[PDB]
């Protein structure tokens, strides 16, 4: 309805494990679970887009690819379109290929899309969109004065609705270079609840307040 | 470490309807707030103060020219100045010129400003006359530091197309206080909080 695109900055995973005198890796696992819970909830409640801010380095890109392979079924199952934003060029060929794969094998699900920000940075994304216009300018570029519409479609999020509600768990109140362009008019919410302790119920209360604001 | 403070002045209209008066009275009051906050930031050694902001503007630039000079306050405007009259543009440019010698504190009024539009003008500039840092220096704010604290008065919680690129890592603050009721005292509590926050992430 009024809330079509929800974006979430998942924070508090490490800090969570710590507070329970546990290993950081243990926190990132519950975090990943909450992620699944949150995307399914959203898919089941008619939301069009859900964007998650996700991100030796050679090993983490391997866990991702194994991760994406693990959940490949859960997407196709619930009919969730997978999409990835960020600088994919910085990933291993093996990973950038699993992603482009999962993306294409889910392109048809046009009702609810789950977007993962991987090796993503708003300034960088906008930089790449610029590099795109310098390499492939639009024919009527000489007759143009405003490039906002040109820029919007060169962004990784091309064809995705603008962010309606941007949420940050973990207590911090910063944007952290996340969807700056796409969140220029998004309703901002913040909560001290660590990501792993974040449940779908919390999401409901927050969404309830969203409408109140509107 | 608090060098650049950006503020979205909002709530001038609700303040007016509340006191049962026309918007003009609220904006009139909001100009005093602006002046007081500005002078307060100069006295406390901030480096830059950016404010998100018709007949009133030319008037303001006219009657306040004196306080910018007395207080050693450098004036600078950002936004799309083209959309302004040939007369309004002169006052603005002239004021930037009559104050360019001040180097300690700078006050930036965002006039006819849009963050998406500013990025659009810098891009166009780059194409025309040729990464992240190159785009940055093409922005209206090119010579100022990144925003450290972005505060929004009025109660609303959204950036509203304001300094999006320049505020990517800024600490966000929201206050229900309406711009005309906002005082230097409110600003101080907020700045004390900003430092408490800066101390908490390192723990």
Short mmCIF file of C-alpha atoms in Angstrom, two decimals:
data_model
loop_
_atom_site.label_atom_id
_atom_site.label_comp_id
_atom_site.label_asym_id
_atom_site.label_seq_id
_atom_site.Cartn_x
_atom_site.Cartn_y
_atom_site.Cartn_z
CA UNK A 1 0.00 0.00 0.00
CA UNK A 2 1.91 2.99 1.36
CA UNK A 3 4.77 0.73 2.43
CA UNK A 4 6.20 -0.93 -0.65
CA UNK A 5 9.94 -0.94 -0.10
CA UNK A 6 11.52 -1.73 3.26
CA UNK A 7 15.27 -1.46 3.75
CA UNK A 8 17.04 -2.73 6.86
CA UNK A 9 20.53 -2.22 8.24
CA UNK A 10 21.17 -5.43 10.21
CA UNK A 11 23.40 -4.49 13.13
CA UNK A 12 24.30 -5.98 16.50
CA UNK A 13 25.36 -9.50 15.49
CA UNK A 14 28.84 -9.42 16.96
CA UNK A 15 27.78 -7.31 19.93
CA UNK A 16 25.02 -9.86 20.52
CA UNK A 17 27.29 -12.90 20.82
CA UNK A 18 29.58 -10.88 23.09
CA UNK A 19 26.76 -10.03 25.53
CA UNK A 20 26.16 -13.77 25.89
CA UNK A 21 29.87 -14.52 26.27
CA UNK A 22 29.85 -16.37 22.94
CA UNK A 23 31.82 -16.59 19.69
CA UNK A 24 31.22 -13.85 17.11
CA UNK A 25 30.50 -16.55 14.52
CA UNK A 26 27.59 -17.75 16.68
CA UNK A 27 25.98 -14.32 16.47
CA UNK A 28 26.23 -14.10 12.69
CA UNK A 29 24.42 -17.43 12.46
CA UNK A 30 21.34 -16.31 14.40
CA UNK A 31 21.51 -13.14 12.34
CA UNK A 32 21.26 -15.14 9.13
CA UNK A 33 18.26 -16.97 10.61
CA UNK A 34 16.47 -13.74 11.47
CA UNK A 35 17.13 -12.73 7.87
CA UNK A 36 15.22 -15.76 6.55
CA UNK A 37 12.42 -15.18 9.05
CA UNK A 38 12.17 -11.54 8.04
CA UNK A 39 12.12 -12.12 4.29
CA UNK A 40 9.45 -14.83 4.53
CA UNK A 41 7.31 -12.67 6.80
CA UNK A 42 7.55 -9.82 4.30
CA UNK A 43 6.82 -12.11 1.34
CA UNK A 44 3.75 -13.37 3.19
CA UNK A 45 2.53 -9.86 3.92
CA UNK A 46 2.51 -8.54 0.36
CA UNK A 47 5.64 -6.36 0.40
CA UNK A 48 7.19 -5.60 -2.98
CA UNK A 49 10.85 -5.12 -2.08
CA UNK A 50 13.06 -5.87 0.91
CA UNK A 51 16.67 -4.72 0.92
CA UNK A 52 19.20 -5.98 3.43
CA UNK A 53 22.57 -4.37 4.08
CA UNK A 54 24.78 -7.46 4.24
CA UNK A 55 28.33 -6.27 3.46
CA UNK A 56 40.67 -14.07 4.79
CA UNK A 57 38.15 -12.27 2.58
CA UNK A 58 38.58 -15.17 0.15
CA UNK A 59 36.94 -17.44 2.74
CA UNK A 60 33.90 -15.29 3.48
CA UNK A 61 32.98 -15.19 -0.23
CA UNK A 62 32.98 -18.98 -0.04
CA UNK A 63 30.54 -19.09 2.87
CA UNK A 64 28.30 -16.71 0.93
CA UNK A 65 28.27 -18.95 -2.14
CA UNK A 66 27.60 -21.99 0.01
CA UNK A 67 24.93 -19.94 1.79
CA UNK A 68 23.27 -18.87 -1.45
CA UNK A 69 23.43 -22.50 -2.55
CA UNK A 70 21.82 -23.64 0.71
CA UNK A 71 18.87 -21.25 0.36
CA UNK A 72 18.53 -21.53 -3.42
CA UNK A 73 15.54 -23.76 -2.70
CA UNK A 74 13.80 -21.46 -0.24
CA UNK A 75 13.69 -18.67 -2.85
CA UNK A 76 12.26 -20.66 -5.75
CA UNK A 77 9.95 -22.30 -3.20
CA UNK A 78 8.30 -19.16 -1.83
CA UNK A 79 8.66 -17.49 -5.23
CA UNK A 80 11.05 -14.78 -4.07
CA UNK A 81 13.04 -12.82 -6.60
CA UNK A 82 16.67 -12.60 -5.61
CA UNK A 83 18.68 -9.54 -6.49
CA UNK A 84 22.10 -8.31 -5.46
CA UNK A 85 23.45 -4.76 -5.39
CA UNK A 86 27.00 -3.61 -4.69
CA UNK A 87 30.33 -3.94 -6.49
CA UNK A 88 30.16 -7.58 -7.67
CA UNK A 89 33.39 -7.07 -9.62
CA UNK A 90 35.29 -7.36 -6.36
CA UNK A 91 34.05 -10.93 -5.85
CA UNK A 92 35.59 -14.23 -6.91
CA UNK A 93 34.39 -15.56 -10.25
CA UNK A 94 32.82 -18.52 -8.42
CA UNK A 95 30.73 -16.19 -6.23
CA UNK A 96 29.78 -13.54 -8.77
CA UNK A 97 28.55 -16.51 -10.81
CA UNK A 98 26.41 -18.10 -8.11
CA UNK A 99 24.76 -14.71 -7.63
CA UNK A 100 24.16 -13.97 -11.32
CA UNK A 101 22.79 -17.52 -11.35
CA UNK A 102 20.36 -17.27 -8.45
CA UNK A 103 19.33 -13.91 -9.88
CA UNK A 104 18.40 -15.30 -13.28
CA UNK A 105 16.71 -18.42 -11.88
CA UNK A 106 14.38 -16.18 -9.86
CA UNK A 107 13.85 -13.27 -12.26
CA UNK A 108 10.27 -14.34 -13.01
CA UNK A 109 8.92 -13.95 -9.47
CA UNK A 110 7.44 -10.48 -9.95
CA UNK A 111 5.56 -9.88 -6.68
CA UNK A 112 8.15 -9.81 -3.89
CA UNK A 113 11.87 -9.21 -4.24
CA UNK A 114 14.54 -9.67 -1.59
CA UNK A 115 17.67 -7.62 -2.26
CA UNK A 116 21.04 -8.25 -0.62
CA UNK A 117 23.64 -5.51 -0.49
CA UNK A 118 26.99 -7.27 -0.98
CA UNK A 119 30.27 -5.36 -0.99
CA UNK A 120 27.89 -2.43 -1.29
CA UNK A 121 28.54 1.25 -0.63
CA UNK A 122 26.23 4.08 -1.67
CA UNK A 123 29.04 6.43 -2.78
CA UNK A 124 30.59 3.60 -4.77
CA UNK A 125 27.27 2.61 -6.32
CA UNK A 126 26.75 6.19 -7.42
CA UNK A 127 30.35 6.31 -8.69
CA UNK A 128 29.74 3.25 -10.83
CA UNK A 129 26.50 4.74 -12.13
CA UNK A 130 28.57 7.74 -13.22
CA UNK A 131 31.17 5.57 -14.91
CA UNK A 132 28.24 4.06 -16.78
CA UNK A 133 27.12 7.43 -18.20
CA UNK A 134 30.65 8.38 -19.24
CA UNK A 135 31.00 5.08 -21.06
CA UNK A 136 27.45 4.78 -22.39
CA UNK A 137 25.82 8.22 -22.36
CA UNK A 138 22.15 8.52 -23.41
CA UNK A 139 21.66 9.63 -27.02
CA UNK A 140 19.72 12.79 -26.01
CA UNK A 141 22.35 13.52 -23.33
CA UNK A 142 23.27 16.72 -25.15
CA UNK A 143 19.67 17.91 -24.90
CA UNK A 144 19.57 17.07 -21.18
CA UNK A 145 20.05 19.36 -18.19
CA UNK A 146 18.87 17.13 -15.35
CA UNK A 147 20.36 13.64 -14.98
CA UNK A 148 18.37 12.43 -11.95
CA UNK A 149 16.25 10.15 -14.12
CA UNK A 150 19.36 9.07 -16.04
CA UNK A 151 21.22 8.30 -12.83
CA UNK A 152 18.34 6.48 -11.18
CA UNK A 153 18.31 3.83 -13.92
CA UNK A 154 22.08 3.30 -14.00
CA UNK A 155 22.00 2.41 -10.29
CA UNK A 156 22.18 -1.23 -9.17
CA UNK A 157 18.61 -0.72 -7.93
CA UNK A 158 17.28 0.25 -11.36
CA UNK A 159 13.54 -0.55 -11.61
CA UNK A 160 13.14 -1.01 -7.84
CA UNK A 161 10.77 1.31 -5.99
CA UNK A 162 12.34 4.04 -3.82
CA UNK A 163 12.81 3.16 -0.16
CA UNK A 164 9.68 3.89 1.87
CA UNK A 165 10.99 2.86 5.26
CA UNK A 166 14.65 2.60 6.26
CA UNK A 167 15.32 0.78 9.54
CA UNK A 168 18.44 0.33 11.64
CA UNK A 169 18.83 -2.22 14.42
CA UNK A 170 21.61 -2.13 16.98
CA UNK A 171 21.05 1.30 18.49
CA UNK A 172 23.31 3.37 16.19
CA UNK A 173 21.78 6.37 14.47
CA UNK A 174 23.84 6.73 11.27
CA UNK A 175 23.00 5.92 7.64
CA UNK A 176 26.35 4.29 6.99
CA UNK A 177 26.51 4.95 3.24
CA UNK A 178 23.44 2.78 2.61
CA UNK A 179 20.88 3.57 -0.10
CA UNK A 180 21.44 7.31 0.24
CA UNK A 181 19.93 8.20 -3.13
CA UNK A 182 17.11 5.66 -2.85
CA UNK A 183 16.29 6.75 0.72
CA UNK A 184 16.11 10.52 0.20
CA UNK A 185 12.48 10.52 1.44
CA UNK A 186 12.32 7.28 3.40
CA UNK A 187 10.81 7.16 6.86
CA UNK A 188 13.63 6.44 9.29
CA UNK A 189 13.32 4.10 12.25
CA UNK A 190 15.88 3.07 14.80
CA UNK A 191 15.73 0.48 17.54
CA UNK A 192 18.27 -0.71 20.17
CA UNK A 193 17.25 -4.33 19.52
CA UNK A 194 20.25 -6.28 18.27
CA UNK A 195 19.70 -7.96 14.92
CA UNK A 196 19.66 -11.58 16.21
CA UNK A 197 16.95 -10.70 18.76
CA UNK A 198 14.93 -8.98 16.07
CA UNK A 199 11.68 -10.83 15.48
CA UNK A 200 8.87 -10.41 12.96
CA UNK A 201 6.70 -9.09 15.78
CA UNK A 202 9.03 -6.14 16.23
CA UNK A 203 8.72 -5.54 12.49
CA UNK A 204 4.94 -5.38 12.86
CA UNK A 205 4.99 -2.76 15.62
CA UNK A 206 7.44 -0.65 13.60
CA UNK A 207 5.24 -0.94 10.51
CA UNK A 208 2.26 0.01 12.63
CA UNK A 209 4.07 3.21 13.68
CA UNK A 210 5.03 3.79 10.04
CA UNK A 211 1.36 4.25 9.10
CA UNK A 212 0.74 6.43 12.15
CA UNK A 213 3.48 8.75 10.87
CA UNK A 214 1.72 8.74 7.52
CA UNK B 1 35.68 16.67 16.38
CA UNK B 2 32.32 18.31 15.70
CA UNK B 3 33.19 20.41 12.67
CA UNK B 4 30.15 20.38 10.40
CA UNK B 5 26.59 20.64 11.66
CA UNK B 6 23.66 20.47 9.24
CA UNK B 7 20.12 21.32 10.30
CA UNK B 8 16.76 20.92 8.65
CA UNK B 9 14.64 23.83 9.91
CA UNK B 10 11.08 22.53 9.95
CA UNK B 11 7.89 23.25 11.89
CA UNK B 12 7.50 26.97 11.21
CA UNK B 13 3.99 26.44 9.87
CA UNK B 14 2.68 24.15 12.61
CA UNK B 15 4.08 26.60 15.15
CA UNK B 16 2.05 29.35 13.50
CA UNK B 17 -1.27 27.48 13.32
CA UNK B 18 -0.72 26.47 16.94
CA UNK B 19 -0.36 30.09 18.05
CA UNK B 20 -3.23 30.86 15.67
CA UNK B 21 -1.28 33.07 13.24
CA UNK B 22 -0.27 33.09 9.57
CA UNK B 23 2.81 31.23 8.32
CA UNK B 24 4.56 34.58 7.87
CA UNK B 25 4.78 35.00 11.64
CA UNK B 26 6.28 31.53 12.08
CA UNK B 27 8.95 32.07 9.41
CA UNK B 28 9.63 35.51 10.89
CA UNK B 29 10.35 33.80 14.23
CA UNK B 30 12.30 31.05 12.52
CA UNK B 31 14.68 33.75 11.26
CA UNK B 32 15.59 34.73 14.80
CA UNK B 33 16.21 31.08 15.59
CA UNK B 34 18.45 30.88 12.52
CA UNK B 35 20.42 33.96 13.58
CA UNK B 36 20.86 32.77 17.18
CA UNK B 37 21.92 29.26 16.25
CA UNK B 38 24.33 30.61 13.60
CA UNK B 39 25.99 33.04 16.02
CA UNK B 40 26.08 30.28 18.65
CA UNK B 41 27.93 27.93 16.28
CA UNK B 42 30.50 30.66 15.47
CA UNK B 43 31.22 31.36 19.14
CA UNK B 44 31.74 27.64 19.81
CA UNK B 45 34.23 27.25 16.97
CA UNK B 46 32.30 24.94 14.66
CA UNK B 47 33.74 25.08 11.15
CA UNK B 48 30.54 24.95 9.19
CA UNK B 49 26.79 25.20 9.73
CA UNK B 50 24.48 24.18 6.88
CA UNK B 51 20.78 25.03 7.01
CA UNK B 52 18.04 23.63 4.77
CA UNK B 53 15.89 26.58 3.65
CA UNK B 54 10.93 34.46 -1.07
CA UNK B 55 10.44 38.17 -0.46
CA UNK B 56 11.79 37.30 2.98
CA UNK B 57 15.09 36.01 1.62
CA UNK B 58 16.15 39.17 -0.20
CA UNK B 59 15.07 41.03 2.94
CA UNK B 60 17.09 38.74 5.21
CA UNK B 61 20.23 39.09 3.10
CA UNK B 62 19.64 42.83 3.27
CA UNK B 63 18.98 43.44 6.97
CA UNK B 64 21.45 40.82 8.20
CA UNK B 65 24.41 41.73 6.01
CA UNK B 66 25.58 43.59 9.12
CA UNK B 67 25.61 40.58 11.50
CA UNK B 68 27.62 38.45 9.06
CA UNK B 69 30.32 41.13 8.95
CA UNK B 70 30.38 42.05 12.64
CA UNK B 71 30.63 38.40 13.71
CA UNK B 72 33.27 37.34 11.13
CA UNK B 73 30.83 34.90 9.54
CA UNK B 74 31.57 33.64 6.05
CA UNK B 75 28.39 33.30 3.97
CA UNK B 76 27.92 30.59 1.38
CA UNK B 77 24.90 29.32 -0.54
CA UNK B 78 24.28 25.97 -2.22
CA UNK B 79 21.49 24.70 -4.42
CA UNK B 80 20.35 25.64 -7.92
CA UNK B 81 20.79 29.43 -7.97
CA UNK B 82 19.76 29.63 -11.63
CA UNK B 83 16.09 29.43 -10.67
CA UNK B 84 16.36 32.73 -8.81
CA UNK B 85 15.75 36.24 -10.15
CA UNK B 86 18.65 38.30 -11.48
CA UNK B 87 18.22 40.56 -8.44
CA UNK B 88 18.12 37.85 -5.78
CA UNK B 89 21.16 36.11 -7.27
CA UNK B 90 23.17 39.33 -6.99
CA UNK B 91 22.49 39.84 -3.29
CA UNK B 92 23.51 36.23 -2.62
CA UNK B 93 26.69 36.31 -4.69
CA UNK B 94 27.57 39.75 -3.39
CA UNK B 95 27.22 38.53 0.21
CA UNK B 96 29.48 35.55 -0.44
CA UNK B 97 31.98 38.04 -1.85
CA UNK B 98 31.70 40.55 0.98
CA UNK B 99 32.47 37.71 3.44
CA UNK B 100 34.91 35.43 1.64
CA UNK B 101 37.75 36.77 3.76
CA UNK B 102 36.42 35.07 6.91
CA UNK B 103 38.02 31.63 7.20
CA UNK B 104 37.06 30.27 10.60
CA UNK B 105 33.31 29.75 10.51
CA UNK B 106 31.10 29.34 7.46
CA UNK B 107 27.29 29.49 7.33
CA UNK B 108 25.69 27.69 4.40
CA UNK B 109 22.10 28.39 3.37
CA UNK B 110 20.73 25.66 1.10
CA UNK B 111 18.58 27.70 -1.29
CA UNK B 112 16.49 25.94 -3.96
CA UNK B 113 18.49 22.86 -2.95
CA UNK B 114 17.96 19.22 -3.76
CA UNK B 115 20.49 16.53 -2.95
CA UNK B 116 19.54 14.54 -6.07
CA UNK B 117 19.78 17.66 -8.15
CA UNK B 118 23.20 18.60 -6.72
CA UNK B 119 24.52 15.18 -7.69
CA UNK B 120 22.96 15.70 -11.10
CA UNK B 121 24.77 18.99 -11.60
CA UNK B 122 28.13 17.58 -10.52
CA UNK B 123 27.72 14.61 -12.85
CA UNK B 124 26.85 16.87 -15.76
CA UNK B 125 29.88 18.95 -14.86
CA UNK B 126 32.15 15.90 -14.90
CA UNK B 127 30.88 14.62 -18.24
CA UNK B 128 31.10 18.08 -19.78
CA UNK B 129 34.56 18.75 -18.33
CA UNK B 130 36.32 15.65 -16.88
CA UNK B 131 36.04 8.68 -8.89
CA UNK B 132 34.21 9.19 -5.59
CA UNK B 133 36.52 12.07 -4.67
CA UNK B 134 36.19 13.63 -8.13
CA UNK B 135 32.38 13.66 -7.81
CA UNK B 136 32.74 15.12 -4.33
CA UNK B 137 34.78 18.14 -5.44
CA UNK B 138 32.13 18.92 -8.05
CA UNK B 139 29.43 19.35 -5.40
CA UNK B 140 28.22 22.74 -4.14
CA UNK B 141 29.93 21.85 -0.84
CA UNK B 142 33.26 20.96 -2.49
CA UNK B 143 35.44 22.82 0.03
CA UNK B 144 33.65 21.93 3.26
CA UNK B 145 34.13 18.82 5.47
CA UNK B 146 31.64 15.91 5.57
CA UNK B 147 28.60 16.37 7.82
CA UNK B 148 29.31 15.20 11.39
CA UNK B 149 25.84 15.79 12.79
CA UNK B 150 22.63 16.12 10.85
CA UNK B 151 19.74 17.32 12.99
CA UNK B 152 16.11 17.64 12.02
CA UNK B 153 13.69 19.80 14.03
CA UNK B 154 9.92 19.61 13.61
CA UNK B 155 9.29 15.99 14.61
CA UNK B 156 9.54 14.33 11.21
CA UNK B 157 12.11 11.59 10.69
CA UNK B 158 13.48 11.63 7.15
CA UNK B 159 16.32 13.44 5.39
CA UNK B 160 14.13 15.00 2.72
CA UNK B 161 16.73 15.10 -0.07
CA UNK B 162 19.21 17.03 2.06
CA UNK B 163 22.98 16.51 1.94
CA UNK B 164 22.56 12.79 1.36
CA UNK B 165 26.07 12.24 -0.01
CA UNK B 166 27.72 14.60 2.50
CA UNK B 167 25.88 12.96 5.43
CA UNK B 168 26.61 9.28 4.70
CA UNK B 169 28.27 8.74 8.10
CA UNK B 170 26.74 11.60 10.08
CA UNK B 171 25.17 11.07 13.48
CA UNK B 172 21.44 11.63 13.11
CA UNK B 173 19.33 13.60 15.56
CA UNK B 174 15.63 14.32 15.58
CA UNK B 175 13.78 16.68 17.85
CA UNK B 176 9.99 17.23 18.09
CA UNK B 177 10.72 20.88 18.86
CA UNK B 178 9.41 23.25 16.20
CA UNK B 179 12.06 25.43 14.60
CA UNK B 180 10.71 28.69 16.12
CA UNK B 181 10.89 27.22 19.64
CA UNK B 182 14.37 25.78 19.09
CA UNK B 183 17.02 27.50 21.22
CA UNK B 184 20.81 27.40 21.65
CA UNK B 185 20.11 25.56 24.88
CA UNK B 186 18.31 22.75 23.06
CA UNK B 187 21.22 22.63 20.65
CA UNK B 188 23.68 22.24 23.54
CA UNK B 189 21.94 19.15 24.97
CA UNK B 190 22.05 17.68 21.51
CA UNK B 191 25.73 18.42 21.08
CA UNK B 192 26.42 16.82 24.49
CA UNK B 193 24.57 13.73 23.27
CA UNK B 194 26.61 13.68 20.08
CA UNK B 195 29.74 13.37 22.23
CA UNK B 196 28.20 10.70 24.46
CA UNK B 197 27.49 8.71 21.29
CA UNK B 198 31.03 9.25 20.02
CA UNK B 199 32.25 7.80 23.32
CA UNK B 200 29.92 4.80 23.27
CA UNK B 201 30.97 3.28 19.95
CA UNK B 202 34.53 3.04 21.26
CA UNK B 203 33.38 0.75 24.06
#
